[PDB]
């Protein structure tokens, strides 16, 4: 077993505590300010849509500024989810031999691992196929995809659509409410980014505290010490 | 079940599992046999040599009580010695009172009553051994075999331990083709035989045989250890028939 | 959530199941016993099943001689009954010593139904899983029969039964006594009464017995005795024709 | 079920010892029995039930003599009563007759008996 | 799921007929340091590997005298051993004052078994966590025994107990024919024991600070060689 | 998770956690330090008081067992008072029977044969007291056979002899430092500034002669507990050498 | 029962510890580097789509570069799932007689078996019919299938589809958002491969550690030793 | 009750231990080699589709080679599920009187019964209406049905729909992705048979071991022995 | 309460133990052979469809032989479910006063009742609206209904459309796979009857054993016996 010892060694040398601590420092400064930034970026973007009047003109183009936010957001989630998997990789490889005793530290490991996964679930978002808890999670990191899909369905009802000899129209639409809905789809998905980020702040601040406190036990789940036996 | 945890507790069907488990531990120890010849009896136990570093002729499993009672058991070895020391006091105080060496039948109750007791209180663990013993008194020879619940009786010959059935069928037999008391000498011989045949459950673990006997004619009323020449003979007189 | 684990806790309906379970154990005996009284004798019946060609039957009974006038039969494990048999066997000795006269059946049964009550209220041990049937020829009631159980109960029986077959051996007697309109068997000598039980039992079980499938004892004018091995074959013969 | 009714030593949140009431249940089950006080006498009675007529009920009393001026009966667990009785007939000598040269008044025997009844309680 | 409701007390049989609390005890003997014993027909020997805490602490001894002709080495919980070796010192003294006869070694086994006994049959306590290798020289010459917390004392020719003890026992099992015959010469019986013990080292090697030895035999009352005096074997 | 609730229960891997937790009780005590020198032995401790109204000397963390043996404890104080008491009686009695002084280790021995009295149930003898003591001891003494000795007593029931050792909340960093300082040719005054230095280090509060107690024992004058003025200047004299190098 | 002993013997000889250890070594070197490779392969592929402008031209062909990644991924999942089943087969056949005692080792077996199944679930992916936990698992190993099915539905609304005489139009759109969605479907499924592989690294590294530590107990769940009875 | 004894007797004589042991021997040799056979049969069938170019020609016929595998598979599942029900029938009829004690053997019975049912669930497969655990089970034994239903839906979009009268048409499928999807549906359902069979090997090997060990307790759940009472 | 005693009396006289024992005897002989009969009836019916070639001709009529099986099956389920409710009615009315003690027999009652309900669930089948366990149950007793509904949907696509004159048609459905699916729907629903009946045998044999053993406790859950109190 001198080779088996090697493999496990190289593993823990690739992902040391320094690797995960760096992730926490980043979240402490950089990553948090960025979230607070995306917060008001979509906050004022929601105020604009509230003071606008929608006409057929706005159904013939996708508001690029909104696409700028939902994109800037998807980017942040991407990073976090990867920086988390880093912290997780640091712990998972340090879970000791399965025993029925001396699991005081192991408990701490599993505990933190759980809070981290709860974070990864938020960022990863809801999706469109669903976990027993539903989709109480604001909006996934696939906001862009869901957004275009929502607006797209309504742009086919307002605009109409054609083919030729008889009449260009083809598909297409009184309902005064259907027009206001195109206005709401732009307003809502901007609100969903406010909330998603507000909660995402809290979650991140929590994991930072949770890590900085239990880190010793996270790396050293068991402290060998045979002073009695000899 | 919550009825197999305590030792005093009765299961809904009046079953005391803790004593039962006690037996499971007994039918796993080595094998012990008991032969009752005409006048006297014969005992034999299977000793298991685990390693080569085991001074032979040492580490005896058969104990004498007073100076006329054979005594052998299987299961938890410490529980063994224990149950016997009591028997040794119980014996002694009895002779000190009545003068006449204790009646083999009397002796058994003393032991039963005692083992009996360890099934009554939940603060103690039932005896983890089956015991076989006997000797020659005023009414000749007797041979009993007490067990973990304190239950017991008289036998023509019996045995307990991991391999006991073979010991039994090859035991009932001797009874059928001899209905009229076996033979002093012969008993020993056939004794060393009944063990080998039963050792085929430990086959891969070379062993050492130990025999003692008690007889009004060869021992002279006293219980003695079968060592020396007759000890060899009996082995071969069994090693030959083993083929 | 363990009412029935402790011998001291009452269920919401004052039950104490541990005492109850105690009983089922008085059945895993698989032996039946009925006792009937003559006019100057008393007889108890019980089957003698010996399932092993190795056990020597001489040491296989469930009826002991408490005193030189009282006899007892037990419906339970030989370990537990052997205990009780001893305590009572000693209460006798001491009673005589402390009072100048031989202890009555009816009493000894009360010392026991009491003993197995204190035994059971103070919780100093688990209740014995057996039923005890006391028989004798008192000098103030002659044909006497009393029976105690694990719950610390007892009473007088004009002739009773015990085993896995209560009712059968029982009702069968209720119809025979329902006729004679009296409370006892009429006959000048035991010999004949004995014959009456075996007779009146095979009837309820539906099986023949030999000089080894049964076991009986009787009480005379102060002189309790166990029926011989061979002698039990006798009355078995005599009543095999006067059908 | 509570988690307080399985200990003589335990008070329920309200203040009711438990094991006692279940014990008192075995009584509210036993065979019916009564007692009537007259002006020139007192009567105590209780019924009898046969397991089977094959048993002699005339060898098991239910109305007992404690003192030649006091008798008593019961309802509940048979066996208890049998010894609770003999302990009562003694605590009647050792505790009174042997100190005052005479038998005890009604009131005090009943209390000397409840005294033995008390012990069974106060003590797990 | 997956519990073991049969290991809470020394007073409970598992469905198969095992006493787990006692088993766990042996497990603590395995966690202790190694010790070896072997004997010929004129002497017996104990070789032990003392352990320690810091480079500042001392190495905890494990050889114990009991009489001029008897002693033992231990593995496991130090205190338990104290109690045991002590009960032994007592038993020998009685057999000495009263009868004026040196307590035979086999007897010392029975005695240590029956005492270890009591602790596996009653409620409230726990079994001794310590194994011992006893040696002595009565009227039957040399003697070596191996006691375990279950009350099982077996008389060997050699052996070892403790972590890695395995390797040393193997060695002894081969060199047997050789040493069982080292009579009249103690210095060689010990060099044998020392070889056998080294078959169990992994961390370091035996230095004058952590090696302990003891002998007894024909004309050698039980004496213990410590430190600076065991140098001629290192 | 399940085997740590009985002082007489082996875990599947042969461990007695209640005993282990016992020890974990000591780490909560304040630091105690002992350094042995061919000149004598030194004992120093961090006092650590909750308030300025406490009377310092009220906290007996260092005490005398006999004229030639002293000690410092760490862990539960009530539990300490009991050991200190037994130890003192042990010494005095032996004196009475032999007209001599008890060997330091033979005393230390009796202190451990005391902790060895835990456990309730009844499997034979009888030793009334439920659990392990929650405290350790640093016993500094001196006798004609083995000179200046220093011991560490643990509730486990065992003990080791040391050249220098530290116990309590700080025994983590303190023990490291001592590992890299101690050497057989240390003078007494040298060890004093060392015990004093390591406390200040892994201690906490500004090291004043109020939150730090220092004592020592020698063949010449036995166990003496340094008064405040001495320790006070020993601190200044200490903190000074820190300027240069 | 000499034949029953045989069957069980041959079984354990077919799948020894060496078989499973080999799987761990492969994951230690080869398999991990491959995942890290597929990681950036789709990372840069996502950067490309971000700096491109989509027109009707891109709806008339499926980007072969992307099909190259989703394929290379499906391939890796395939292998892992099979190499896992190897490790599982090694343990499953070594689960001892069902008892109510001496299950300290058995617990370890079941424990590791669970972590392995959790791994197999990730690789096998979500699917399209769902387990009470939902589809919080990135993307299955059937990405190719789900991808073409997603894009296909949009390529019909865009190119639109048809007939002849007079104009090929039939229906196409004006929905400007439906065009951007075709762009996002290519971007998302490339992001889903980044994440799926990042997490898959962590999972694999964990199982390696978990195995290398408890392996002794995995093969020898119970260690017979009757020293007391005799 | 002499007749009630009869019924229970005949029941256990119809399905003895020999009946179930035979099933295990078959799985030991025959049935396992067959699964390993179906494994590579669809393995190479998946390699073929990977090196092929799909055109309108392949949408006008169903690949007979694939129908040969999915069929050969459905056949194997059928057999196993029946051979299992055999083993189950052998146990179910040997479950003793319901008691609150002496259930050490009964536990073993229920335990094995559970592992068997877990096997039957895999073979029976997922289906199309689902159990709270979802459909994490590869593919049911109704692969044939699900396959033709999946391909069929795509053969209509690529084949066309043309309804008639001679004056207007219907249309011919342009989405380049819809064509590749027809290619994937053939590739995936071939991969699903590889996996389904790989796992099915493991499962079967497990049940064999589990049976061969606990079989004694399976037939004799309680061993009467009243040595104390008498 | 002399009238309240009456009602409960008449209830138990209407459904005695004899009523339920009769049901068991029927299942012992008659009902089991019938299931084994329906087993091979659909076994050979599945072999026939396997050796047939489907054309437009088979889409213009429903195979009467298959309707003969699915019907003969639905009939058997019907009977069983009724004969079960008989056994259940025999027990349900014999459940004693709700107590917190002496429930050793009551436990047996509830136990058997559970196994019976598990049987009733199988026969009643899955349905089309579902219980948290899903539809892992083969096919309901509404096979006929589900079958015609499945085939019907495909007979419209194949057939499409069909107005006549003999020189042109309507539709469609050129999908070669859609034709094979009509062949599979006949083959599958025949296989589903094989399995459903194989398992249904096992279930029935089990309930027979389970009943014949605990029947005493089923009728007499509590055995009054006050020998202590008096």
Swiss-Prot record, chain B:
One of its GO terms (biological process) is proteasomal ubiquitin-independent protein catabolic process. GO terms for molecular function: mRNA binding. It comes from the Eukaryota. Keywords: Acetylation, Cytoplasm, Nucleus, Proteasome. The alpha and beta forms are probably products of the same gene with different post-translational modifications. Signal peptide: none annotated. The keyword DNA damage does not apply. It is found in: Cytoplasm; Nucleus. The keyword Ribosomal protein does not apply. GO terms for cellular component: nucleus; proteasome complex; proteasome core complex, alpha-subunit complex; proteasome storage granule. Present with 12000 molecules/cell in log phase SD medium. Belongs to the peptidase T1A family. The 26S proteasome consists of a 20S proteasome core and two 19S regulatory subunits. The 20S proteasome core is composed of 28 subunits that are arranged in four stacked rings, resulting in a barrel-shaped structure. The two end rings are each formed by seven alpha subunits, and the two central rings are each formed by seven beta subunits. The catalytic chamber with the active sites is on the inside of the barrel. This is Probable proteasome subunit alpha type-7. The gene is PRE10.
UniProtKB/Swiss-Prot annotation, chain C:
GO terms for cellular component: mitochondrion; nucleus; proteasome complex; proteasome core complex, alpha-subunit complex. Transmembrane segments: none annotated. Keywords: Acetylation, Cytoplasm, Isopeptide bond, Nucleus, Phosphoprotein, Proteasome, Ubl conjugation. Signal peptide: none annotated. It comes from the Eukaryota. It is found in: Cytoplasm; Nucleus. There is a cross-link at residue 223 (Glycyl lysine isopeptide (Lys-Gly) (interchain with G-Cter in ubiquitin)). It holds the Pfam family Proteasome_A_N. GO terms for biological process: proteasomal ubiquitin-independent protein catabolic process; proteasome-mediated ubiquitin-dependent protein catabolic process. The modification Phosphoserine is found at residue 228. The 26S proteasome consists of a 20S proteasome core and two 19S regulatory subunits. The 20S proteasome core is composed of 28 subunits that are arranged in four stacked rings, resulting in a barrel-shaped structure. The two end rings are each formed by seven alpha subunits, and the two central rings are each formed by seven beta subunits. The catalytic chamber with the active sites is on the inside of the barrel. Interacts with CIC1. Belongs to the peptidase T1A family. Present with 15200 molecules/cell in log phase SD medium. This is Proteasome subunit alpha type-1. It comes from Saccharomyces cerevisiae (strain ATCC 204508 / S288c) (Baker's yeast). The lineage of its organism: Eukaryota, Fungi, Dikarya, Ascomycota, Saccharomycotina. The gene is SCL1.
From Swiss-Prot, chain E:
Keywords: Cytoplasm, Isopeptide bond, Nucleus, Phosphoprotein, Proteasome, Ubl conjugation. Belongs to the peptidase T1A family. InterPro entries: Ntn_hydrolases_N (IPR029055), Proteasome_alpha (IPR050115), Proteasome_alpha-type (IPR023332), Proteasome_asu_N (IPR000426), Proteasome_sua/b (IPR001353). It comes from the Eukaryota. GO terms for biological process: proteasomal ubiquitin-independent protein catabolic process; proteasome-mediated ubiquitin-dependent protein catabolic process. This is Proteasome subunit alpha type-6. The proteasome degrades poly-ubiquitinated proteins in the cytoplasm and in the nucleus. It is essential for the regulated turnover of proteins and for the removal of misfolded proteins. The proteasome is a multicatalytic proteinase complex that is characterized by its ability to cleave peptides with Arg, Phe, Tyr, Leu, and Glu adjacent to the leaving group at neutral or slightly basic pH. It has an ATP-dependent proteolytic activity. There is a cross-link at residue 191 (Glycyl lysine isopeptide (Lys-Gly) (interchain with G-Cter in ubiquitin)). The modification Phosphoserine is found at residue 14. The keyword Phosphoprotein applies. It comes from Saccharomyces cerevisiae (strain ATCC 204508 / S288c) (Baker's yeast). GO terms for cellular component: nucleus; proteasome complex; proteasome core complex, alpha-subunit complex; proteasome storage granule. Gene3D superfamilies: Glutamine Phosphoribosylpyrophosphate, subunit 1, domain 1. It holds the Pfam family Proteasome_A_N. The keyword Phosphoprotein applies. It is found in: Cytoplasm; Nucleus.
UniProtKB/Swiss-Prot annotation, chain F:
It is found in: Cytoplasm; Nucleus. This is Proteasome subunit alpha type-5. The 26S proteasome consists of a 20S proteasome core and two 19S regulatory subunits. The 20S proteasome core is composed of 28 subunits that are arranged in four stacked rings, resulting in a barrel-shaped structure. The two end rings are each formed by seven alpha subunits, and the two central rings are each formed by seven beta subunits. The catalytic chamber with the active sites is on the inside of the barrel. One of its GO terms (cellular component) is nucleus. Disulfide bonds: none annotated. Changing residue 44 to D: In DOA5-1; slight decrease in activity. NCBIfam families: PRK03996.1. It comes from Saccharomyces cerevisiae (strain ATCC 204508 / S288c). The gene is PUP2. It comes from the Eukaryota. The proteasome degrades poly-ubiquitinated proteins in the cytoplasm and in the nucleus. It is essential for the regulated turnover of proteins and for the removal of misfolded proteins. The proteasome is a multicatalytic proteinase complex that is characterized by its ability to cleave peptides with Arg, Phe, Tyr, Leu, and Glu adjacent to the leaving group at neutral or slightly basic pH. It has an ATP-dependent proteolytic activity. Signal peptide: none annotated. The modification Phosphothreonine is found at residue 50. Belongs to the peptidase T1A family. The modification Phosphoserine is found at residue 51. Keywords: Cytoplasm, Nucleus, Phosphoprotein, Proteasome.
């Amino acid at each position: 077993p001198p080779k088996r010892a090697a493999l496990i060694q190289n593993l823990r040398d690739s992902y040391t505590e320094t690797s995960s601590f760096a992730v926490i420092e980043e979240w402490a400064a950089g990553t948090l300010q960025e979230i607070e930034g995306i917060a008001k970026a979509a906050a004022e973007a929601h105020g604009v849509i509230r003071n606008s009047t929608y006409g057929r003109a706005q159904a013939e183009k996708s508001p690029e500024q909104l696409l700028g936010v939902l994109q800037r957001y998807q980017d942040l989630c991407h990073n976090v989810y990867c920086q988390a998997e880093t912290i997780r990789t640091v712990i998972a490889i340090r879970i000791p031999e399965h025993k029925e005793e001396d699991n005081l530290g192991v408990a701490v490991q599993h505990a933190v691992l759980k809070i981290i996964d709860e974070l990864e679930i938020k960022t990863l978002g809801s999706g469109e196929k669903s976990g027993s808890g539903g989709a109480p999670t604001p909006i996934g990191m696939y906001a862009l995809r869901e957004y275009l899909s929502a607006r797209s369905t309504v742009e086919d009802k307002l605009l109409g659509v054609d083919a030729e000899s008889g009449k260009t129209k083809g598909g297409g639409s009184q309902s005064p409410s259907l027009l206001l809905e195109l206005r709401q789809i732009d307003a809502d998905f901007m609100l969903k980014v406010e909330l998603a980020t507000t909660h995402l702040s809290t979650m991140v601040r929590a994991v930072i505290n949770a890590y900085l406190l239990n880190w010793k036990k996270l790396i050293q789940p068991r402290t060998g010490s045979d002073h009695m036996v000899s | 079940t919550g009825y197999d945890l305590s030792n005093s507790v009765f299961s809904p069907d009046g079953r005391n599992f803790q004593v039962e488990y006690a037996v499971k531990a007994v039918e796993n120890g080595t094998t012990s046999i008991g032969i009752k010849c005409n006048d006297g009896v014969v005992f034999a136990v299977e000793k298991l040599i685990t390693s080569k570093l085991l001074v032979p002729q040492k580490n005896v499993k058969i104990q004498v009580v007073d100076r006329h009672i054979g005594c052998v058991y299987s299961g938890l070895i410490p529980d063994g010695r224990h149950l016997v020391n009591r028997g040794r006091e119980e014996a002694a105080s009895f002779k000190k009172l009545y003068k006449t060496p204790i009646p083999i039948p009397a002796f058994a109750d003393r032991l039963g009553q005692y083992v009996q007791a360890h099934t009554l209180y939940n603060s103690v663990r039932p005896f983890g051994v089956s015991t076989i013993f006997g000797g020659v008194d005023k009414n000749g020879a007797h041979l009993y075999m007490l067990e973990p619940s304190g239950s017991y009786w008289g036998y023509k010959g019996a045995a307990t331990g991991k391999g006991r059935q073979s010991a039994k069928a090859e035991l009932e037999k001797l009874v059928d083709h001899h209905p009229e008391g076996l033979s002093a000498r012969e008993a020993v011989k056939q004794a060393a035989k009944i063990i080998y045949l039963a050792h085929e459950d430990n086959k891969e673990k070379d062993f050492e045989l130990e025999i003692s006997w008690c007889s009004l004619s060869e021992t002279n009323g006293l219980h003695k250890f079968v060592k020396g020449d007759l000890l060899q003979e009996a082995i071969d007189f069994a090693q030959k028939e083993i083929n | 959530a363990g009412y029935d684990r402790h011998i001291t806790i009452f269920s919401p309906e004052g039950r104490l199941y541990q005492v109850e379970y105690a009983f089922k154990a008085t059945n895993q005996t698989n032996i039946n016993s009925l006792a009937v009284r003559g006019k100057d004798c008393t007889v108890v019946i019980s089957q003698k099943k010996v399932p092993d060609k190795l056990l020597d039957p001489t040491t296989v009974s469930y009826i002991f001689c408490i005193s030189r006038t009282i006899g007892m039969v037990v419906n339970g494990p030989i370990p537990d009954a052997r205990n009780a048999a001893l305590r009572a066997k000693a209460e006798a000795a001491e009673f005589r010593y402390k009072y100048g006269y031989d202890m009555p059946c009816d009493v000894l049964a009360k010392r026991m139904a009491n003993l197995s009550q204190i035994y059971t209220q103070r919780a100093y041990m688990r209740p014995l899983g057996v039923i005890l049937t006391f028989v004798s020829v008192d000098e103030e009631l002659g044909p006497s029969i009393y029976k105690t159980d694990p719950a610390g109960y007892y009473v007088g029986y004009k002739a009773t039964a015990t085993g896995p077959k209560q009712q059968e051996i029982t009702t069968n007697l209720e119809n025979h006594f329902k006729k004679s309109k009296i409370d006892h068997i009429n006959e000048e000598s035991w010999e004949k009464v004995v014959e009456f039980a075996i007779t009146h039992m095979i009837d309820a079980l539906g099986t023949e017995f030999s000089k080894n499938d049964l076991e009986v004892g009787v009480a005379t004018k102060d002189k309790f005795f166990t029926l011989s091995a061979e002698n039990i074959e006798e009355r078995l013969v005599a009543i095999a024709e006067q059908d | 079920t509570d988690r307080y009714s399985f200990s003589l030593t335990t008070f329920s949140p309200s203040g009711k010892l438990g094991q006692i009431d279940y014990a008192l249940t075995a009584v509210k089950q036993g065979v019916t029995s009564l007692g009537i006080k007259a002006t020139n006498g007192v009567v105590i009675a209780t019924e009898k039930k046969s397991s089977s007529p094959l048993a002699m009920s005339e060898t098991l009393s239910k109305v007992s003599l404690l003192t030649p001026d006091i008798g008593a009966v019961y309802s509940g667990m048979g066996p208890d009563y049998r010894v609770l009785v003999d302990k009562s007939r003694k605590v009647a000598h050792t505790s009174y007759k042997r100190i005052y040269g005479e038998y005890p008044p009604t009131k005090l025997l009943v209390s000397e008996v409840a005294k033995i009844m008390q012990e069974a309680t106060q003590s797990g | 799921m997956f519990r073991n409701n049969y290991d809470g007390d020394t007073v409970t049989f598992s469905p198969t007929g095992r006493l787990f609390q006692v088993e766990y005890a042996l497990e603590a003997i395995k966690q202790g340091s190694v010790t070896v014993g072997l004997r010929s027909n004129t002497h017996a020997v104990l070789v032990a590997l003392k352990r320690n805490a810091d480079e500042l602490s001392s190495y905890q001894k494990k050889i114990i005298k009991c009489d001029e002709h008897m002693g033992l080495s231990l593995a496991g919980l130090a205190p338990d051993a104290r109690v045991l070796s002590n009960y032994l010192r007592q038993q020998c003294n009685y057999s000495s004052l009263v009868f004026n006869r040196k307590l035979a070694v086999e007897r010392a086994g029975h005695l240590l078994c029956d005492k270890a006994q009591k602790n596996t049959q009653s409620y409230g306590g726990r079994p001794y966590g310590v194994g011992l290798l006893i040696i002595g020289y009565d009227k039957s010459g040399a003697h070596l025994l191996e006691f375990q917390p279950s009350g099982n004392v077996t008389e060997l020719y050699g052996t070892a107990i403790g972590a890695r003890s395995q390797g040393a026992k193997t060695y002894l099992e081969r060199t047997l024919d050789t040493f069982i015959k080292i009579d009249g010469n103690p210095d060689e019986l010990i060099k044998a024991g020392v070889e056998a013990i080294s078959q169990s080292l992994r961390d370091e090697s035996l230095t004058v600070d952590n090696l302990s030895i003891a002998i007894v035999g024909k004309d050698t009352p039980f004496t213990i060689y410590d430190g600076e005096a065991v140098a001629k074997y290192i | 998770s399940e085997y740590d609730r009985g002082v007489s229960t082996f875990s599947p891997e042969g461990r007695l956690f209640q005993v282990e937790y016992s020890l974990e009780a000591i780490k909560l005590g304040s630091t105690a330090i002992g350094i042995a020198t061919k000149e004598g032995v030194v004992l120093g401790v961090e006092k650590r008081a909750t308030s300025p109204l406490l009377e310092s000397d009220s906290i007996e963390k260092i005490v005398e067992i006999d004229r030639h043996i002293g000690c410092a404890m760490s862990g539960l104080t009530a539990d300490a008072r009991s050991m200190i008491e037994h130890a003192r009686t042990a010494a005095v009695t032996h004196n009475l029977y032999y007209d001599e002084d008890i060997n330091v280790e033979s005393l230390t021995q009796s202190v451990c044969d005391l902790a060895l009295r835990f456990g309730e149930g009844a499997s034979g003898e009888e030793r009334l007291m439920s659990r392990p003591f929650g405290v350790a001891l640093l016993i500094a003494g001196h006798d004609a056979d083995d000179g200046y000795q220093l011991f560490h007593a643990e509730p486990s029931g065992t003990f080791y002899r040391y050249n220098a050792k530290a116990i309590g909340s700080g025994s983590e960093g303190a023990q490291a430092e001592l590992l890299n300082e101690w050497h057989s040719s240390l003078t007494l005054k040298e060890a004093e500034l060392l015990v004093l230095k390591i406390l200040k280090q892994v201690m906490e509060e500004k090291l004043d002669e109020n939150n730090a107690q220092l004592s020592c024992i020698t063949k010449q004058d036995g166990f003496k507990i340094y008064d405040n003025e001495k320790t006070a200047e020993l601190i200044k004299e200490l903190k000074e050498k820190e300027a240069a190098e």
